[PDB]
């Protein structure tokens, strides 16, 4: 299985990282500061695949203090791929 997630980077952000927890099925889960670099995709879009996973809660961050959603707010729940530009889409919008 595995979730591919694409994320449109806000202009003022550094390169996005994907933080995730509540993996199902359970898979290794990085620390906030060790959340992985999303690979550059096309233009503003970046991407990362969580291996081994049907569902996840996730937050986007950079190496700075930016994150979406806010500090402490629950991760976005996916399900399925994958495109977030401020709202979620099954296809590139
Ligand atoms: O790990 C569960 C926890 O993850 C998310 O928390 C982040 C938080 O949003 C960051 O600002 C920073 O404090 O690191 C935390 C993870 O260690 C969710 O926001 C939170 O709801 C969830 O419980």
């Amino acid at each position: 299985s595995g979730l591919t997630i694409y994320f449109k980077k806000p202009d003022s952000w550094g390169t996005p990282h994907l933080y995730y927890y509540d993996t199902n099925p359970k898979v290794d889960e990085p620390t906030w500061s060790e959340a992985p670099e999303m690979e550059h995709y096309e233009g503003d879009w970046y991407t990362h695949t969580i291996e081994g996973v049907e569902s996840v809660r996730l937050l986007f961050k950079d190496r700075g203090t930016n994150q979406w959603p806010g500090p402490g707010e629950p991760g976005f729940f996916r399900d399925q791929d994958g495109w977030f530009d401020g709202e979620w889409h099954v296809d590139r919008p």
Side-chain angles (χ1 to χ4, degrees):
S1 280
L3 256 22
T4 304
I5 280 132
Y6 296 89
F7 172 66
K8 204 184 210 258
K9 184 183 86 60
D11 286 344
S12 73
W13 279 33
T15 119
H17 294 53
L18 189 77
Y19 170 83
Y20 56 91
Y21 61 102
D22 278 16
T23 53
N24 188 39
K26 195 47 68 148
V27 95
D28 286 354
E29 278 167 18
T31 270
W32 187 249
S33 54
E34 273 146 27
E37 254 229 349
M38 302 185 81
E39 247 123 288
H40 178 30
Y41 178 74
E42 270 186 57
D44 296 341
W45 288 96
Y46 291 77
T47 190
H48 181 89
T49 303
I50 297 163
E51 311 292 1
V53 120
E54 293 295 339
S55 79
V56 106
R57 291 189 167 84
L58 68 88
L59 288 88
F60 310 100
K61 48 183 314 294
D62 64 9
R63 286 195 62 94
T65 65
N66 295 129
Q67 59 180 273
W68 192 350
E73 299 290 354
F76 289 117
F77 183 76
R78 299 258 108 202
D79 266 5
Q80 61 193 19
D81 308 344
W83 310 66
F84 187 80
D85 58 357
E87 309 286 354
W88 284 99
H89 313 273
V90 307
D91 306 305
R92 155 122 105 147

XYZ file of all heavy atoms in Angstrom:
806
model
N 0.852 -1.226 0.000
C 0.000 0.000 0.000
C 0.870 1.253 0.000
O 1.967 1.296 -0.611
C -0.868 0.015 1.254
O -2.003 -0.827 1.109
N 0.386 2.274 0.706
C 1.193 3.456 0.936
C 0.594 4.725 0.395
O -0.030 4.744 -0.671
N 0.808 5.804 1.131
C 0.176 7.057 0.773
C 1.191 7.952 0.099
O 2.294 8.170 0.622
C -0.385 7.728 2.026
C -1.892 7.664 2.246
C -2.537 6.516 1.480
C -2.213 7.578 3.731
N 0.829 8.409 -1.089
C 1.528 9.492 -1.765
C 0.718 10.755 -1.539
O -0.514 10.817 -1.694
C 1.692 9.194 -3.281
O 2.358 7.936 -3.445
C 2.640 10.180 -3.952
N 1.436 11.764 -1.102
C 0.825 13.019 -0.735
C 1.598 14.120 -1.421
O 2.825 14.127 -1.465
C 0.818 13.162 0.828
C -0.353 12.350 1.388
C 0.661 14.599 1.240
C 0.043 11.534 2.473
N 0.854 15.049 -1.983
C 1.437 16.136 -2.706
C 1.001 17.335 -1.941
O -0.099 17.341 -1.414
C 0.902 16.176 -4.137
C 1.281 14.963 -4.954
C 0.456 13.829 -4.965
C 2.441 14.955 -5.736
C 0.777 12.697 -5.718
C 2.785 13.813 -6.493
C 1.941 12.697 -6.467
O 2.254 11.570 -7.171
N 1.852 18.352 -1.883
C 1.543 19.539 -1.083
C 2.027 20.778 -1.784
O 3.198 20.873 -2.093
C 2.237 19.428 0.283
C 2.142 20.661 1.118
C 0.914 21.094 1.603
C 3.302 21.379 1.461
C 0.828 22.241 2.417
C 3.221 22.554 2.264
C 1.998 22.962 2.766
N 1.130 21.723 -2.038
C 1.519 23.007 -2.603
C 2.145 23.924 -1.542
O 1.461 24.368 -0.626
C 0.320 23.695 -3.221
C 0.750 24.685 -4.288
C -0.446 25.437 -4.823
C -0.194 25.816 -6.287
N 0.194 27.220 -6.417
N 3.426 24.251 -1.714
C 4.163 25.022 -0.742
C 3.699 26.496 -0.698
O 3.614 27.151 -1.720
C 5.655 24.895 -1.033
C 6.546 25.593 -0.027
C 8.052 25.491 -0.397
C 8.484 26.607 -1.370
N 8.276 27.971 -0.794
N 3.375 27.019 0.483
C 3.108 28.461 0.576
C 4.418 29.215 0.214
O 5.537 28.697 0.451
C 2.707 28.658 2.022
C 2.414 27.220 2.564
C 3.301 26.324 1.781
N 4.285 30.368 -0.437
C 5.458 31.099 -0.968
C 6.492 31.396 0.105
O 7.680 31.228 -0.138
C 5.071 32.385 -1.709
C 4.453 32.102 -3.097
O 4.556 30.977 -3.685
O 3.837 33.031 -3.686
N 6.041 31.778 1.290
C 6.971 32.145 2.380
C 7.576 30.960 3.153
O 8.314 31.187 4.129
C 6.241 32.965 3.403
O 5.397 32.066 4.102
N 7.237 29.728 2.780
C 7.758 28.561 3.475
C 9.086 28.114 2.909
O 9.343 28.228 1.697
C 6.810 27.340 3.371
C 5.642 27.330 4.325
C 4.926 28.426 4.805
C 5.017 26.174 4.896
N 3.915 27.992 5.635
C 3.939 26.622 5.699
C 5.252 24.797 4.807
C 3.103 25.737 6.392
C 4.431 23.922 5.521
C 3.361 24.394 6.283
N 9.884 27.528 3.783
C 11.007 26.720 3.334
C 10.513 25.419 2.692
O 9.302 25.220 2.576
N 11.418 24.532 2.265
C 10.917 23.343 1.571
C 10.150 22.441 2.513
O 10.548 22.266 3.627
C 11.930 22.654 0.573
O 12.220 21.300 0.947
C 13.203 23.346 0.479
N 8.984 21.989 2.121
C 8.098 21.332 3.074
C 8.584 19.972 3.589
O 9.188 19.202 2.814
C 6.800 21.168 2.273
C 7.205 21.299 0.825
C 8.366 22.142 0.786
N 8.287 19.698 4.865
C 8.408 18.363 5.442
C 7.025 17.774 5.774
O 6.045 18.495 5.964
C 9.333 18.337 6.667
C 10.765 18.646 6.359
N 11.165 19.780 5.675
C 11.909 17.982 6.685
C 12.485 19.780 5.558
N 12.960 18.693 6.156
N 6.937 16.458 5.768
C 5.683 15.792 6.044
C 5.801 15.093 7.389
O 6.609 14.140 7.532
C 5.365 14.779 4.954
C 3.940 14.215 5.088
C 3.007 15.282 4.573
C 3.707 12.916 4.323
N 5.060 15.585 8.378
C 5.027 14.940 9.689
C 3.769 14.075 9.722
O 2.710 14.496 9.195
C 5.085 15.973 10.835
C 4.802 15.359 12.170
C 5.821 14.716 12.893
C 3.518 15.376 12.710
C 5.572 14.127 14.127
C 3.255 14.785 13.938
C 4.308 14.152 14.634
O 4.092 13.533 15.834
N 3.860 12.875 10.310
C 2.706 11.977 10.325
C 2.682 11.052 11.529
O 3.714 10.686 12.035
C 2.637 11.168 9.012
C 3.891 10.361 8.680
C 4.014 9.031 9.122
C 4.924 10.910 7.889
C 5.140 8.280 8.832
C 6.034 10.181 7.582
C 6.144 8.850 8.071
O 7.243 8.092 7.758
N 1.493 10.676 11.998
C 1.385 9.787 13.158
C 0.066 9.074 12.967
O -0.595 9.296 11.927
C 1.440 10.578 14.469
C 0.313 11.590 14.618
C -0.798 11.317 15.427
C 0.356 12.820 13.938
C -1.868 12.269 15.562
C -0.685 13.778 14.077
C -1.771 13.492 14.878
O -2.763 14.423 14.954
N -0.322 8.243 13.949
C -1.450 7.337 13.838
C -1.386 6.505 12.557
O -2.431 6.313 11.915
C -2.772 8.111 13.790
C -3.264 8.523 15.153
O -2.465 8.492 16.134
O -4.444 8.938 15.314
N -0.192 6.043 12.163
C -0.116 5.211 10.977
C -0.907 3.913 11.176
O -0.919 3.305 12.265
C 1.330 4.920 10.495
O 2.103 4.384 11.565
C 2.055 6.202 10.127
N -1.610 3.536 10.120
C -2.292 2.264 10.064
C -2.095 1.631 8.685
O -2.496 2.203 7.653
C -3.769 2.425 10.371
C -4.464 1.095 10.522
O -3.894 0.164 11.097
N -5.688 0.980 9.992
N -1.467 0.462 8.656
C -0.914 -0.179 9.847
C 0.338 0.525 10.399
O 0.963 1.360 9.728
C -0.556 -1.586 9.334
C -1.389 -1.739 8.072
C -1.299 -0.373 7.453
N 0.697 0.167 11.626
C 1.762 0.847 12.331
C 3.102 0.723 11.617
O 3.530 -0.351 11.203
C 1.852 0.365 13.780
C 2.699 1.250 14.714
C 2.367 2.773 14.563
C 0.953 3.182 15.053
N 0.947 4.577 15.591
N 3.778 1.852 11.523
C 4.997 1.959 10.787
C 5.854 2.927 11.599
O 5.325 3.603 12.479
C 4.640 2.392 9.347
C 4.725 3.919 9.134
C 5.397 1.552 8.306
N 7.161 2.978 11.374
C 7.993 3.907 12.126
C 7.494 5.352 11.894
O 7.022 5.695 10.794
C 9.490 3.712 11.813
C 10.101 2.409 12.487
O 9.402 1.717 13.276
O 11.281 1.984 12.271
N 7.538 6.158 12.962
C 6.988 7.508 12.991
C 8.038 8.534 13.443
O 8.432 8.571 14.612
C 5.775 7.543 13.918
C 4.485 7.048 13.251
C 3.343 6.778 14.226
O 3.377 7.269 15.367
O 2.381 6.082 13.857
N 8.538 9.356 12.530
C 9.464 10.431 12.924
C 8.905 11.401 13.916
O 7.740 11.721 13.921
C 9.723 11.186 11.623
C 8.656 10.810 10.774
C 8.357 9.321 11.070
N 9.800 11.816 14.783
C 9.762 13.077 15.497
C 9.442 14.327 14.611
O 9.799 14.370 13.451
C 11.162 13.162 16.093
O 11.138 12.530 17.391
C 11.588 14.532 16.353
N 8.739 15.308 15.178
C 8.486 16.618 14.560
C 9.732 17.146 13.809
O 9.638 17.449 12.603
C 8.031 17.625 15.649
C 7.579 18.966 15.110
C 8.210 20.178 15.243
C 6.387 19.218 14.359
N 7.476 21.159 14.620
C 6.360 20.585 14.058
C 5.327 18.406 13.902
C 5.347 21.147 13.318
C 4.336 18.956 13.196
C 4.328 20.317 12.913
N 10.895 17.208 14.488
C 12.098 17.812 13.894
C 12.752 16.906 12.866
O 13.566 17.334 12.064
C 13.129 18.224 14.936
O 13.443 17.137 15.774
N 12.364 15.650 12.873
C 12.925 14.723 11.921
C 11.926 14.334 10.848
O 12.266 13.512 10.010
C 13.517 13.502 12.643
C 14.969 13.724 13.077
C 15.323 13.040 14.392
O 14.682 12.012 14.736
O 16.266 13.518 15.079
N 10.726 14.946 10.838
C 9.807 14.761 9.713
C 10.562 14.916 8.385
O 11.296 15.903 8.229
C 8.667 15.745 9.769
N 10.374 13.984 7.431
C 11.116 14.028 6.165
C 10.733 15.124 5.152
O 9.555 15.543 5.010
C 10.869 12.649 5.541
C 9.511 12.191 6.110
C 9.441 12.830 7.485
N 11.797 15.553 4.457
C 11.775 16.402 3.284
C 10.859 15.850 2.229
O 11.024 14.726 1.792
C 13.180 16.473 2.663
C 13.900 17.777 2.884
C 14.524 18.398 1.634
O 14.608 17.775 0.560
O 14.945 19.561 1.724
N 9.915 16.656 1.780
C 9.132 16.241 0.643
C 9.987 16.500 -0.597
O 10.602 17.574 -0.709
C 7.804 16.976 0.627
C 7.024 16.745 1.898
S 5.435 17.474 1.826
C 4.549 16.238 0.888
N 10.097 15.488 -1.462
C 10.755 15.616 -2.759
C 10.064 16.679 -3.572
O 8.844 16.746 -3.563
C 10.652 14.294 -3.523
C 12.007 13.603 -3.710
C 12.072 12.170 -3.158
O 12.089 11.974 -1.907
O 12.136 11.218 -3.984
N 10.833 17.511 -4.268
C 10.257 18.487 -5.188
C 9.522 17.765 -6.301
O 10.039 16.808 -6.855
C 11.348 19.425 -5.762
C 10.834 20.422 -6.763
N 9.549 20.926 -6.729
C 11.441 21.024 -7.809
C 9.380 21.785 -7.718
N 10.518 21.870 -8.385
N 8.310 18.204 -6.622
C 7.545 17.558 -7.706
C 7.523 18.383 -8.990
O 8.266 18.072 -9.912
C 6.146 17.138 -7.256
C 5.322 16.520 -8.347
C 5.578 15.225 -8.796
C 4.289 17.236 -8.949
C 4.807 14.659 -9.821
C 3.535 16.695 -9.951
C 3.779 15.412 -10.393
O 2.991 14.883 -11.413
N 6.703 19.429 -9.041
C 6.587 20.330 -10.193
C 6.115 21.686 -9.704
O 5.058 21.779 -9.072
C 5.543 19.822 -11.183
C 6.072 18.878 -12.264
C 5.011 18.523 -13.303
O 4.448 19.450 -13.938
O 4.733 17.317 -13.489
N 6.879 22.740 -9.999
C 6.515 24.089 -9.572
C 6.473 24.229 -8.057
O 7.484 23.993 -7.385
N 5.307 24.595 -7.514
C 5.149 24.727 -6.061
C 4.901 23.386 -5.360
O 4.949 23.297 -4.153
C 3.988 25.660 -5.734
C 4.206 27.093 -6.215
O 5.371 27.482 -6.477
O 3.232 27.897 -6.367
N 4.636 22.343 -6.127
C 4.210 21.067 -5.568
C 5.349 20.187 -5.149
O 6.341 20.062 -5.869
C 3.390 20.327 -6.593
C 2.056 20.922 -6.786
C 1.701 21.807 -7.738
C 0.896 20.687 -5.978
N 0.369 22.101 -7.619
C -0.147 21.439 -6.530
C 0.634 19.897 -4.836
C -1.437 21.462 -5.976
C -0.658 19.874 -4.316
C -1.678 20.662 -4.872
N 5.198 19.592 -3.968
C 6.154 18.648 -3.426
C 5.418 17.385 -3.055
O 4.198 17.386 -2.934
C 6.816 19.221 -2.187
C 7.744 20.377 -2.486
C 7.243 21.667 -2.767
C 9.109 20.187 -2.488
C 8.102 22.722 -3.025
C 9.975 21.238 -2.739
C 9.467 22.491 -3.011
O 10.356 23.496 -3.311
N 6.168 16.312 -2.817
C 5.562 15.006 -2.677
C 6.294 14.108 -1.695
O 7.532 14.185 -1.555
C 5.387 14.357 -4.102
O 4.590 13.170 -4.000
C 6.723 13.891 -4.719
N 5.538 13.255 -0.999
C 6.179 12.169 -0.251
C 5.230 10.972 -0.127
O 4.010 11.137 0.001
C 6.664 12.647 1.110
C 7.355 11.595 1.936
N 8.710 11.354 1.859
C 6.887 10.778 2.906
C 9.042 10.418 2.729
N 7.953 10.051 3.378
N 5.808 9.776 -0.216
C 5.072 8.539 -0.071
C 5.402 7.931 1.293
O 6.577 7.676 1.636
C 5.447 7.573 -1.248
O 5.178 8.232 -2.484
C 4.560 6.325 -1.324
N 4.363 7.713 2.088
C 4.546 6.942 3.310
C 4.423 5.452 2.970
O 3.327 4.964 2.649
C 3.549 7.371 4.383
C 3.803 8.830 4.748
C 3.674 6.458 5.614
C 2.671 9.486 5.480
N 5.540 4.727 3.002
C 5.441 3.277 2.755
C 4.657 2.562 3.880
O 4.719 2.960 5.062
C 6.819 2.603 2.535
C 7.778 3.266 1.544
C 7.346 3.212 0.064
O 6.249 2.670 -0.282
O 8.117 3.768 -0.772
N 3.899 1.536 3.486
C 3.347 0.550 4.400
C 1.990 0.813 5.008
O 1.569 0.091 5.921
N 1.276 1.799 4.474
C 0.235 2.500 5.212
C -1.077 2.591 4.415
O -1.063 2.884 3.213
C 0.829 3.916 5.587
C 0.051 5.067 5.017
C 1.066 4.054 7.078
N -2.202 2.326 5.058
C -3.499 2.596 4.456
C -3.939 4.009 4.858
O -4.399 4.795 4.021
C -4.596 1.622 4.943
C -4.480 0.152 4.532
C -4.609 -0.094 3.023
O -5.181 0.772 2.282
O -4.137 -1.175 2.571
N -3.845 4.303 6.154
C -4.289 5.585 6.683
C -3.214 6.222 7.603
O -2.321 5.527 8.131
C -5.635 5.437 7.394
O -5.444 4.903 8.693
N -3.340 7.548 7.766
C -2.396 8.399 8.464
C -3.087 9.707 8.912
O -4.087 10.125 8.307
C -1.147 8.668 7.550
C -1.123 10.069 6.960
C 0.121 8.398 8.285
N -2.575 10.309 9.998
C -2.798 11.731 10.299
C -1.511 12.486 10.006
O -0.383 12.031 10.344
C -3.247 11.954 11.744
C -4.649 11.416 11.996
C -5.262 11.797 13.356
N -6.689 11.490 13.354
C -7.187 10.276 13.632
N -6.387 9.239 13.943
N -8.490 10.091 13.602
N -1.650 13.613 9.323
C -0.458 14.299 8.879
C -0.495 15.815 9.042
O -1.556 16.453 8.972
C -0.084 13.870 7.442
C -1.049 14.309 6.327
C -0.798 15.733 5.683
C -1.073 13.227 5.278
N 0.683 16.399 9.231
C 0.802 17.846 9.218
C 1.925 18.203 8.252
O 2.931 17.482 8.175
C 1.128 18.373 10.605
C -0.001 18.318 11.612
C 0.013 16.910 12.350
C 0.049 19.485 12.574
N 1.781 19.331 7.563
C 2.916 19.901 6.817
C 3.657 20.901 7.699
O 3.028 21.603 8.507
C 2.441 20.549 5.520
C 1.538 19.647 4.682
C 0.141 19.810 4.715
C 2.085 18.610 3.882
C -0.720 18.941 3.940
C 1.257 17.775 3.087
C -0.164 17.938 3.126
N 4.978 20.922 7.562
C 5.887 21.868 8.245
C 7.078 22.229 7.324
O 7.289 21.588 6.263
C 6.450 21.306 9.577
C 6.997 19.875 9.492
C 7.487 19.333 10.861
C 8.372 20.376 11.638
N 9.691 20.663 10.950
N 7.828 23.259 7.708
C 9.155 23.418 7.139
C 10.230 23.193 8.216
O 9.902 22.778 9.312
C 9.300 24.738 6.361
C 9.172 25.961 7.211
O 9.138 25.878 8.470
O 9.108 27.099 6.673
N 11.493 23.439 7.921
C 12.543 23.309 8.944
C 12.427 24.449 9.977
O 13.011 24.353 11.059
C 13.948 23.287 8.324
C 14.321 21.955 7.607
C 15.839 21.764 7.283
N 16.681 21.732 8.506
C 17.075 20.622 9.189
N 16.729 19.383 8.791
N 17.830 20.770 10.281
N 11.685 25.512 9.632
C 11.386 26.588 10.575
C 10.271 26.268 11.563
O 10.118 25.104 12.007
N 9.458 27.288 11.863
C 8.312 27.151 12.757
C 6.975 27.120 12.038
O 5.913 27.208 12.691
C 8.259 28.337 13.764
O 8.023 29.570 13.030
C 9.603 28.515 14.460
N 6.986 27.034 10.719
C 5.717 27.056 10.021
C 5.148 25.651 10.074
O 5.881 24.654 10.073
C 5.902 27.470 8.564
C 6.409 28.907 8.403
O 7.414 29.167 7.679
N 5.730 29.851 9.053
N 3.834 25.567 10.116
C 3.163 24.266 9.996
C 1.743 24.549 9.572
O 1.227 25.658 9.745
C 3.173 23.432 11.306
C 2.505 24.135 12.481
C 2.541 23.298 13.734
O 1.649 22.472 13.969
N 3.601 23.442 14.502
N 1.136 23.530 9.009
C -0.259 23.576 8.587
C -0.813 22.137 8.772
O -0.361 21.225 8.095
C -0.292 24.007 7.113
C -1.613 24.378 6.560
C -2.827 24.213 7.132
C -1.840 25.031 5.303
N -3.818 24.662 6.280
C -3.232 25.186 5.156
C -0.991 25.470 4.257
C -3.801 25.790 4.046
C -1.553 26.033 3.141
C -2.943 26.226 3.050
N -1.759 21.915 9.675
C -2.387 22.947 10.523
C -1.554 23.400 11.739
O -0.425 22.912 11.947
C -3.647 22.239 11.004
C -3.213 20.903 11.171
C -2.362 20.606 9.923
N -2.121 24.329 12.508
C -1.475 24.978 13.629
C -0.896 24.076 14.717
O -1.179 22.877 14.828
N -0.081 24.677 15.565
C 0.527 23.923 16.645
C -0.552 23.189 17.417
O -1.544 23.797 17.849
C 1.193 25.022 17.480
C 1.479 26.073 16.517
C 0.312 26.108 15.588
N -0.386 21.868 17.546
C -1.273 21.086 18.412
C -2.552 20.619 17.722
O -3.231 19.722 18.210
N -2.909 21.225 16.591
C -4.158 20.826 15.921
C -3.958 19.419 15.355
O -2.883 19.093 14.844
C -4.515 21.795 14.783
C -4.750 23.240 15.197
C -6.047 23.438 16.007
O -6.867 22.489 16.178
O -6.266 24.566 16.500
N -4.988 18.598 15.378
C -4.846 17.245 14.808
C -4.387 17.253 13.354
O -4.721 18.163 12.555
C -6.269 16.630 14.897
C -7.177 17.679 15.645
C -6.347 18.906 15.863
N -3.625 16.228 13.008
C -3.218 16.006 11.631
C -4.422 15.921 10.698
O -5.550 15.651 11.162
N -4.199 16.197 9.404
C -5.201 15.888 8.398
C -5.270 14.326 8.316
O -4.253 13.658 8.371
C -4.846 16.509 7.041
C -4.987 18.022 6.973
C -3.871 18.813 6.728
C -6.230 18.650 7.094
C -3.962 20.204 6.655
C -6.328 20.052 6.999
C -5.183 20.823 6.778
N -6.471 13.768 8.222
C -6.646 12.314 8.024
C -6.771 11.923 6.546
O -7.657 12.397 5.851
C -7.886 11.815 8.801
C -8.087 10.341 8.716
C -7.291 9.465 9.466
C -9.036 9.807 7.860
C -7.466 8.080 9.370
C -9.218 8.419 7.751
C -8.433 7.562 8.507
N -5.849 11.097 6.073
C -5.943 10.379 4.782
C -5.758 8.881 5.126
O -4.886 8.604 5.930
C -4.738 10.808 3.959
C -4.644 12.271 3.650
C -5.073 12.499 2.266
N -6.349 13.144 2.284
C -7.206 13.132 1.285
N -6.958 12.471 0.156
N -8.331 13.809 1.436
N -6.423 7.840 4.624
C -7.218 7.476 3.451
C -6.639 7.075 2.120
O -6.700 5.915 1.750
C -8.611 8.065 3.364
C -9.610 7.123 3.936
O -9.165 6.090 4.468
O -10.828 7.312 3.956
N -6.164 8.039 1.369
C -5.877 7.814 -0.024
C -5.090 9.004 -0.436
O -5.098 10.008 0.271
C -7.176 7.695 -0.825
C -8.092 8.892 -0.812
C -9.483 8.559 -1.370
O -9.865 7.383 -1.437
N -10.233 9.585 -1.777
N -4.357 8.888 -1.531
C -3.726 10.053 -2.115
C -4.814 11.191 -2.250
O -6.004 10.889 -2.410
C -3.175 9.615 -3.476
C -2.279 8.336 -3.413
O -1.782 7.848 -2.400
O -2.009 7.735 -4.464
N -4.479 12.484 -2.201
C -3.153 12.962 -2.064
C -2.835 14.426 -2.334
O -1.695 14.736 -1.996
N -3.689 15.307 -2.915
C -3.218 16.725 -3.251
C -3.796 17.874 -2.421
O -5.021 18.145 -2.453
C -3.360 17.128 -4.733
C -2.787 16.144 -5.720
C -3.243 14.867 -5.971
C -1.656 16.343 -6.605
N -2.452 14.267 -6.923
C -1.476 15.146 -7.331
C -0.777 17.420 -6.857
C -0.469 14.994 -8.289
C 0.233 17.255 -7.798
C 0.358 16.054 -8.514
N -2.917 18.569 -1.704
C -3.387 19.628 -0.823
C -2.879 21.004 -1.214
O -1.674 21.261 -1.084
C -3.003 19.365 0.650
C -3.614 20.342 1.601
C -4.953 20.203 2.015
C -2.874 21.419 2.077
C -5.518 21.104 2.905
C -3.443 22.360 2.956
C -4.750 22.200 3.383
N -3.801 21.900 -1.594
C -3.442 23.266 -1.987
C -4.150 24.273 -1.103
O -4.353 25.422 -1.513
C -3.831 23.536 -3.452
C -5.302 23.330 -3.693
O -6.095 22.923 -2.803
O -5.764 23.583 -4.814
N -4.553 23.832 0.092
C -5.423 24.602 0.963
C -6.776 23.925 1.131
O -7.540 24.253 2.050
N -7.098 23.040 0.195
C -8.190 22.064 0.342
C -7.666 20.756 -0.251
O -6.712 20.782 -1.038
C -9.459 22.466 -0.421
C -9.971 23.871 -0.176
C -10.622 24.021 1.187
O -10.787 23.030 1.905
O -10.957 25.140 1.552
N -8.282 19.635 0.102
C -7.807 18.341 -0.409
C -8.479 17.958 -1.720
O -9.660 18.201 -1.898
C -8.071 17.225 0.603
C -7.132 17.221 1.742
C -7.356 17.738 2.964
C -5.808 16.679 1.774
N -6.249 17.566 3.763
C -5.290 16.905 3.053
C -4.994 16.034 0.838
C -4.015 16.494 3.437
C -3.684 15.603 1.232
C -3.231 15.832 2.515
N -7.710 17.326 -2.600
C -8.149 16.855 -3.917
C -7.595 15.446 -4.259
O -6.464 15.080 -3.893
C -7.635 17.825 -4.971
C -7.875 19.251 -4.625
N -9.046 19.895 -4.933
C -7.109 20.149 -3.965
C -8.995 21.134 -4.479
N -7.832 21.311 -3.883
N -8.398 14.664 -4.962
C -7.982 13.348 -5.385
C -7.050 13.536 -6.594
O -6.121 12.751 -6.759
C -9.193 12.339 -5.559
C -10.040 12.307 -4.251
C -10.132 12.731 -6.712
N -7.242 14.622 -7.365
C -6.336 14.932 -8.474
C -5.729 16.319 -8.369
O -6.282 17.196 -7.723
C -7.028 14.822 -9.827
C -7.683 13.494 -10.046
O -7.019 12.449 -9.942
O -8.881 13.417 -10.318
N -4.584 16.504 -9.017
C -3.936 17.796 -9.112
C -4.899 18.867 -9.683
O -5.425 18.740 -10.774
C -2.633 17.665 -9.895
C -2.201 18.946 -10.567
C -0.864 19.495 -10.210
N 0.053 19.232 -11.299
C 1.062 20.000 -11.687
N 1.362 21.164 -11.120
N 1.794 19.559 -12.675
N -5.200 19.872 -8.878
C -6.203 20.901 -9.221
C -5.804 21.953 -10.271
O -4.614 22.062 -10.425
C -6.483 21.585 -7.854
C -5.245 21.342 -7.043
C -4.644 20.053 -7.517
O 2.224 13.466 17.688
C 0.866 13.698 17.998
C 0.552 15.174 17.867
O 1.080 15.600 16.621
C 0.747 16.892 16.174
O 1.678 17.813 17.183
C 2.838 18.517 16.825
C 2.489 19.987 16.996
O 1.366 20.297 16.168
C 3.739 20.802 16.711
O 3.461 22.177 16.854
C 4.860 20.374 17.651
O 4.547 20.721 18.989
O 5.104 18.969 17.556
C 3.963 18.137 17.768
C 4.326 16.672 17.583
O 5.347 16.252 18.483
C -0.712 17.265 16.278
O -0.816 18.659 16.163
C -1.258 16.879 17.632
O -2.651 17.168 17.607
C -0.940 15.407 17.906
O -1.424 15.002 19.162
